[PDB]
Write a protein that binds this ligand. Structure first.
Ligand SMILES: *[C@@H]1O[C@H](CO)[C@@H](O[C@@H]2O[C@H](CO)[C@@H](O[C@@H]3O[C@H](CO[C@H]4O[C@H](CO[C@H]5O[C@H](CO)[C@@H](O)[C@H](O)[C@@H]5O)[C@@H](O)[C@H](O[C@H]5O[C@H](CO)[C@@H](O)[C@H](O)[C@@H]5O)[C@@H]4O)[C@@H](O)[C@H](O[C@H]4O[C@H](CO)[C@@H](O)[C@H](O)[C@@H]4O)[C@@H]3O)[C@H](O)[C@H]2NC(C)=O)[C@H](O)[C@H]1NC(C)=O
Lengths: 146, 45, 92, 50, 50, 73
C-alpha cells in the first residue's frame, strides 16, 4: 500500500485478480498451489472520509516432501525397526545391551542433525518432532525393559 | 543339578518374556508409525 | 558372518556400530547435498541402500544368534529344519 | 543390571558420551558469557558428575 | 538526537486523548489484530520512558 | 431495516437484504490506532456478530442505529 497517501488522495487498484506467474522460475522445494490478490479498504474512527487502501497478494505453497522423507524419515524408521530386535537376541549372547545402547547413540547422533532442520517455532510441535519423541521414548522403554 | 534346574526356570521365564515383548514392541512400533503420518497422508490424498 | 555365533562373538556389536558410522556419514553427507526435493542423489540412494542392507545384516545376525544360543531345555529342535540345515544344504 | 552381563560400564560410558553430544549441541546456541551458567548447563554438569 | 541536544530539541512521549482527557503514551504501540506474535518470545511488558 | 454499511465507499445507508434485520457496529484497534483511532466496520446481519476479545461489537434493531462515531444518528 501507499505509505503516506490515503485512499481519498491516491487510489491503488489491482491490475489483475491474480499475480502474474508467466515468468515464474520453478522452485525446487515449493509448489504454488494458488494465488490471488485482494484490495482492502479500511475506515477509521478518526476520519470517515479518508479510507486507507492496500492490496494483499498471497501464495498458497505446498512443500515437496521428498528431501525430508529420504534424509530424515527413513533412518528414523530404520532405527525404530531395530529397537524391537533386542527382544529376539538372546540374553546369553550379551549383545542385548550393546545393541539397544548403540541404537540409542545413533538416534541421539541423528537428533543432533534433526534439531537444526526442524523449525524452532515453539507455537506447536512439528509432526516430525512428535515422531522423534515417540522413537526416543520407545528406545528408552525398550532399554528399561531389556 | 537341582540348582541348575532352578536357574533354568528363571531363564525360561526370561525367554517367554522376550517372546511376548518382541511382538508387543513390533506392534507398538507399527501403530506409532501409523498414528502420526496416516492423518496427514489422508488429507494429502 | 565370519564372527562366531558364540560367547565372545561381537557380530551385533560390529553391525550396529557400522550402522552408527554410516549415520555419522549421513550427517557429513547432509552438509554437502543441496536441500532441493526434485530428485534423490546417487550418493543418497547408495547411502540409503547401504543403511537398509546394514539393518538386514543386523536382523540376520540377531536371527543367527537366536538359533545358535538355543538349548534343549528351552527349544525342541524341528526335525525338518534340522535335516535341511545339516544334511540337505550340504547336499545341495 | 547384573554384573554377569558384562555390560554395566558400557551403559554408563555411553550415557556420558550422549551427554557430551548434548553439551556440544547446547553450547553452540548460547554466548560464552561468564555472568552465570545456564540452567541446562548446570543440569548437564551435575548429570556428567553423577 | 546526536545533531541536536537537550538545549536545541526537547524530546517527549506522544500524547493521545480519550474522553477529552489527554494522557501520555508510555508504552510501545502494538497492533492487537495484525501483530504476528513471534515464534519464540512473548512480550510481557513494553514501557517507554523519557 | 436500514443500516449504515462500510461495504460501500463512502459509508452509506442501505436497506438490509431480506433475512437480515439487525444493524451492528464493530470497532477494533490496529497498528494505526496511534493516530487514526479504531477501525470501524458497519453492516447488517441476521444475528448479532461474534466478537473477538479485542473487538467491540454493538447490536441494535432501529434504523440508522449504527452511525460512524463522527456521524450523528
Ligand atoms: C490465505 O491468507 C489470505 C490472507 O493473508 C486470505 O485472504 C483472504 O481471502 C478471502 C477470500 O479467500 C478474502 O475475503 C474476501 O475479501 C474481499 C475484500 O473486499 C473488500 O472490499 C469489498 C468491497 O469492494 C468490492 O467492490 C470493489 C469494486 O466494486 C472490488 O474491488 C472488491 O473486490 C469488491 O468486489 C468489501 O465488501 C469487503 O468487505 C470487508 O470489509 C467489510 C467492512 O470493512 C466487512 O463487512 C466484510 O466482512 C469484509 O471484511 C472488503 O472491504 C471481499 O470483497 C470478499 O467478499 C466475498 O465474500 C463475501 C462473503 O464471503 C461475499 O459477501 C462477497 O459477495 C464476495 O463473494 C471476501 O470477503 C479476505 O479478504 C482475504 N484477506 C486478506 C487479508 O487478504 C486467503 O483466503 C487465505 N487462503 C487460503 C487459506 O487458502
Amino acid at each position: 500500500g501507499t505509505w503516506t497517501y490515503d485512499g481519498s488522495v491516491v487510489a491503488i487498484n489491482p491490475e489483475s485478480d491474480q499475480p502474474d506467474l508467466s515468468n515464474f522460475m520453478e522452485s525446487g522445494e515449493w509448489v504454488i498451489k494458488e494465488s490471488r490478490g485482494w484490495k482492502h479498504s479500511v475506515t477509521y474512527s478518526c476520519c470517515p472520509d479518508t479510507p486507507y487502501l492496500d492490496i494483499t497478494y498471497h501464495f498458497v505453497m505446498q512443500r515437496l516432501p521428498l528431501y525430508f522423507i529420504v534424509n530424515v524419515i527413513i533412518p528414523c524408521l530404520l532405527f525404530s525397526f531395530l529397537t524391537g530386535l533386542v527382544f529376539y537376541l538372546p540374553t546369553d549372547s550379551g549383545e542385548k545391551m550393546t545393541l539397544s545402547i548403540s541404537v540409542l547413540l545413533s538416534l541421539t547422533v541423528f537428533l543432533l542433525v534433526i534439531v537444526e532442520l526442524i523449525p524452532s517455532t515453539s507455537s506447536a510441535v512439528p509432526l516430525i518432532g512428535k515422531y522423534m519423541l515417540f522413537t526416543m521414548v520407545f528406545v528408552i522403554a525398550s532399554i528399561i525393559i531389556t | 543339578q537341582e540348582s541348575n534346574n532352578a536357574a533354568a526356570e528363571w531363564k525360561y521365564v526370561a525367554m517367554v518374556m522376550d517372546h511376548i515383548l518382541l511382538g508387543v514392541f513390533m506392534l507398538v512400533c507399527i501403530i506409532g508409525t501409523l498414528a502420526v503420518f496416516a492423518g496427514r497422508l489422508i488429507e494429502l490424498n | 558372518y565370519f564372527l562366531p555365533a558364540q560367547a565372545g562373538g561381537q557380530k551385533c556389536t560390529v553391525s550396529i556400530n557400522v550402522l552408527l558410522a554410516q549415520t555419522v556419514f549421513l550427517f557429513l553427507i547432509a552438509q554437502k547435498i543441496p536441500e532441493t526435493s526434485l530428485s534423490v542423489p546417487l550418493l543418497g540412494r547408495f547411502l540409503i541402500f547401504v543403511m537398509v542392507v546394514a539393518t538386514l545384516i543386523v536382523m540376520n545376525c540377531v536371527i543367527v544368534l537366536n538359533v545358535s544360543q538355543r538349548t534343549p531345555t528351552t527349544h525342541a529342535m524341528s526335525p525338518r529344519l534340522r535335516h535341511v540345515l545339516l544334511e540337505l544344504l550340504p547336499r545341495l | 543390571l547384573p554384573a554377569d552381563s558384562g555390560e554395566k560400564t558400557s551403559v554408563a560410558i555411553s550415557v556420558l558420551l550422549a551427554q557430551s553430544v548434548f553439551l556440544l549441541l547446547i553450547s553452540k546456541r548460547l554466548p560464552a558469557t561468564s555472568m552465570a551458567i545456564p540452567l541446562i548447563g548446570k543440569f548437564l554438569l551435575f548429570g556428567m558428575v553423577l | 538526537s546526536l545533531k541536536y541536544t537537550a538545549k536545541e530539541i526537547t524530546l517527549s512521549l506522544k500524547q493521545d486523548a480519550k474522553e477529552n482527557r489527554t494522557y501520555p503514551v508510555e508504552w510501545i504501540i502494538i497492533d492487537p489484530e495484525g501483530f504476528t506474535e513471534n515464534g519464540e518470545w512473548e512480550i510481557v511488558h513494553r514501557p517507554a520512558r523519557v | 431495516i436500514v443500516c449504515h454499511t462500510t461495504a460501500t465507499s463512502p459509508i452509506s445507508a442501505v436497506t438490509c437484504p431480506p433475512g437480515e434485520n439487525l444493524c451492528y457496529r464493530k470497532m477494533w484497534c490496529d497498528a494505526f490506532c496511534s493516530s487514526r483511532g479504531k477501525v470501524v466496520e458497519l453492516g447488517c446481519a441476521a444475528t448479532c456478530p461474534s466478537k473477538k476479545p479485542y473487538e467491540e461489537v454493538t447490536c441494535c434493531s432501529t434504523d440508522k442505529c449504527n452511525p460512524h462515531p463522527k456521524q450523528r444518528p
